[PDB]
């Protein structure tokens, strides 16, 4: 049964909620971005209209093969009355096709849900700053200060950096990125652009990436491995064992391995800045852990949702123990008091 935090209250809306069945009184499920936690229960079997961004529609449609009639993408910054309800869809600055949803509710409420997102300065000039929201359904993933972790900008950087070094003292250097969903693409697109390589990957990761309409795709990204030093790898093969084996395939064009495991926050963050980061090497294979995150940090959270003044909010993660809700409720008080709303 569908958990209250996923309801719309005074509409037939739900947001991620397709693992549940038929939810009683929905009459359109939204889906703010195409990661499995959120999409969990959709197929080709599904008969409900879904609303959602055009990249998640073409993602939807390809991937999960749901039929076209059930679909429904909505332009970004555009009023769209749905069964009756005046809604928004704003970028949310997460991974590609991912929105947060503006509700003006009949009564005169107005809802803001951020799906997944990381908060940015940028969206206190968007659609939000002309008007007063009431509740906020929000993405607490980090919602404690030792989360912190550097910009994407200053992450790319160092990738870039260090896989340039290393290709340029030794041209046979094949580097290789984990992945396991849609996301965090500029970290293999970056490197390949200063390699001057196009990124080589399967056929059934090829076909999500030429969903997400990225400029000049088909440019960067290819299916011939034998063409591209840079390599995309399933996420539980970046370890020692699962890059000697793929380094055997390559046919003697290459005698090391670079490879880049695009993590969240780990507790190593606690104690080395970015610059300072190191890999774990054996042999002529070496692995960096990177730091690059696509939702807030605890100071982006904090920052935003005082700037936006919502009356209530309702956390969306961590809400399974009595020990992560009690301590986020503390920090939305901290942050009242501190602001004065
Ligand atoms: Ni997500």
Redesign the pocket.
């Known amino acids: 049964t569908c958990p209250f935090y996923k309801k719309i209250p005074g509409t037939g809306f739900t947001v991620d909620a397709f693992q549940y069945g038929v939810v009683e009184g929905c009459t359109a499920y939204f889906l703010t ?1 195409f ?1 499995s936690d ?1 999409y969990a229960g959709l197929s080709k079997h599904f008969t409900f209209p879904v609303y959602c961004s055009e990249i998640t529609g073409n993602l939807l449609k390809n991937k999960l093969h749901v039929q076209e009639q059930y679909i429904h993408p909505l332009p970004l910054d555009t009023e769209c009355i749905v069964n009756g309800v005046k809604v928004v869809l704003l970028d949310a600055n ?2 590609p096709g991912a929105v947060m949803i503006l509700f003006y509710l009949p009564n005169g409420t107005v809802i803001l849900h951020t799906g ?1 997102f990381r908060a940015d300065p940028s969206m206190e000039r968007s659609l939000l700053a002309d008007q007063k929201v009431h509740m906020l359904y929000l993405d607490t993933t980090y919602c404690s200060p030792e989360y912190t972790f550097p910009s994407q900008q200053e992450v790319i950087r160092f990738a870039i950096n260090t896989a340039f070094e290393a290709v340029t003292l030794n041209p046979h250097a094949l580097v290789v990125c984990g992945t396991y969903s849609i996301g965090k693409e500029k970290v293999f697109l970056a490197i390949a652009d200063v390699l001057g390589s196009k990124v080589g990957m399967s056929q059934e990761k090829y076909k999500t990436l030429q969903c997400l309409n990225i400029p000049e795709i088909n440019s960067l990204i290819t299916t011939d491995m034998c063409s591209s030093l840079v390599h995309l790898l399933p996420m539980m093969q970046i370890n020692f064992k699962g890059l000697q084996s793929h380094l055997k395939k390559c046919g003697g064009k290459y005698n090391q391995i670079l490879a880049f495991r695009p993590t969240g926050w780990t507790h190593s963050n606690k104690f080395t800045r970015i610059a300072d980061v190191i890999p774990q090497t054996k042999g002529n294979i070496s692995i960096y852990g990177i730091p690059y995150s696509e939702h807030s940090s605890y100071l982006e959270m904090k920052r935003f949702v005082q700037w936006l003044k919502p009356q209530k909010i309702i956390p969306t993660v961590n809400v399974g123990t009595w020990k992560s809700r009690s301590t986020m409720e503390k920090y939305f008080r901290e942050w009242k008091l501190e602001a004065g709303y």
């Open positions: 971005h990661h959120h997460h991974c997944d």
